[PDB]
């Protein structure tokens, strides 16, 4: 429960927008820095942060392409930025890079990886907690540009530090702060290019519970798709109000509980928090059970692997009224379901 304890994707990292017919995650140099400052927390705090000892939540907008409960490991996804090329007359004057002819940013395919420059523990992780938010960040390649920005050589924080580290890491290919010809130039705008991203989750034989993150922006939301691979455990999943790409690969004796309380009612967002409205009358009209598929409302759950008596019965659950927990018990084998109240 406590779908209210969990923040909305983008609360910390920021939500990208369209300002001039272009996706822009940040628009002021100062503010760009803070984002990096934010990104850097994966080193400082770790991959996962704990909400109240109970819920493991990945860092906001941290691209994770794999969670493996067998290895206790994760794999980071693509987080790159456009490389520079062709400075002339470079010096280091007063800790600030100087140039006669300023370097040019370019979209040409060799891109620099931000994540590579990061020191993160992605192995021997502590995934003991039963409660875990699924990642909310798709693969991206940041465009950017600089602009003449006086008086920001004073700027120093975990953000400027990471930015500096990227410069040093990719010698003569990245300069976020520099003086050229007349005045000081700084990266002013972060312009992401999100990409289709399949997050893979390899499950152990334990009991695990997953909350789909609430991602309001539709565009970003639909770049993601989760692929679960069960191995004979007990798996719980709270769907968001949003129809998300979910594929479940079935192992022998896989028991799946899918909370659909966000599917069967209208859900809105009021003060940057979920707001559960009234149950859709004739919600069962929207329920379609096909061979290796559950369609409820417009949400889709695809199924792969061996379907039999050990793993064919998946339990969709929500609350028909305040104090009535209903279970839609779907039989994948016979494309039939039934209705209980416990």
């Amino acid at each position, epitope marked *: 429960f406590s779908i209210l304890l969990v923040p909305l994707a983008g609360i910390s990292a920021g939500i990208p927008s369209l300002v001039n017919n272009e996706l822009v995650l940040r628009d002021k140099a100062t503010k760009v820095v803070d984002y990096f400052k934010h990104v850097s927390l994966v080193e400082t705090e770790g991959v996962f942060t704990l909400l109240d000892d109970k819920v493991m939540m990945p860092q906001d907008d941290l691209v994770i392409s794999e969670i493996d409960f067998n290895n206790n490991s994760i794999v980071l996804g693509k987080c790159e930025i456009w490389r520079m090329e062709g400075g002339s007359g470079h010096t280091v004057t007063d800790d600030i890079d100087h140039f006669f002819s300023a370097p040019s940013i370019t979209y040409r395919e060799p891109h620099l990886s931000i994540y590579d420059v990061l020191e993160v523990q992605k192995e021997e992780l502590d995934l003991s907690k039963d409660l875990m938010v699924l990642p909310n960040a798709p693969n991206r390649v940041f465009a950017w540009e600089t602009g003449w920005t006086p008086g920001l050589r004073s700027l120093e924080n975990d953000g400027t530090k990471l930015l500096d580290r990227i410069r040093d890491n990719y010698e003569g290919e990245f300069y976020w702060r520099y003086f050229a010809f007349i005045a000081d130039a700084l990266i002013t705008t972060l312009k992401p290019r999100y990409e289709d991203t399949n997050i893979r989750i390899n499950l152990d034989s334990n009991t695990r519970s997953f909350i789909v993150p609430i991602i309001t922006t*539709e565009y970003i939301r639909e770049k993601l798709s989760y692929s679960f691979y069960g191995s004979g455990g007990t798996y719980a999943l709270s769907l968001s*109000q949003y129809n998300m790409g979910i594929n479940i690969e079935l192992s022998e004796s896989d028991v799946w509980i899918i909370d659909v309380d966000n599917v069967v009612r209208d859900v809105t967002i009021e003060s940057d928090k979920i707001k559960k409205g009234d149950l859709i009358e004739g919600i069962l009209s929207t329920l379609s059970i096909e061979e290796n598929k559950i369609i409820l409302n417009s949400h889709e759950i695809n199924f792969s692997g061996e379907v039999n008596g050990s793993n064919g019965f998946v339990s969709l659950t929500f609350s028909i009224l305040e104090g009535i927990n209903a279970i839609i018990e779907v039989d994948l084998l016979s494309k039939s379901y039934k209705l209980l109240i416990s």
Partner: nanobody
Amino acid sequence: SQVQLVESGGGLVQPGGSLRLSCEASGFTLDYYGIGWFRQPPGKEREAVSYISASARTILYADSVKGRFTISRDNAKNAVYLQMNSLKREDTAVYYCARRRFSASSVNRWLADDYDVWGRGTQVAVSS
């Protein structure tokens, strides 16, 4: 005049017929925006018809047109399409194309406050 959503292809057909509506999205990049189709029958409210999300993955139709209408979009050629089949007389309306705001955090997806650009509509009448 920059950002527009011009619809075309409306006219007259006879019950059980079919036609195809066109939306020439102009003056922005609709690879980001989700597009909807709405309609207003004579003397009635504006009505939800179909709604394609940016990138497919969310093709929704109103119960009145399920099975009959089919929605499609060519981001590349910046146009959305609605193929209409088995046209009944109840389908007589003024059909509109509209772009869903990029930031719409509502599952309704037809809320009409979540839409920023609206076309002029094309009328469809159905009578033999």
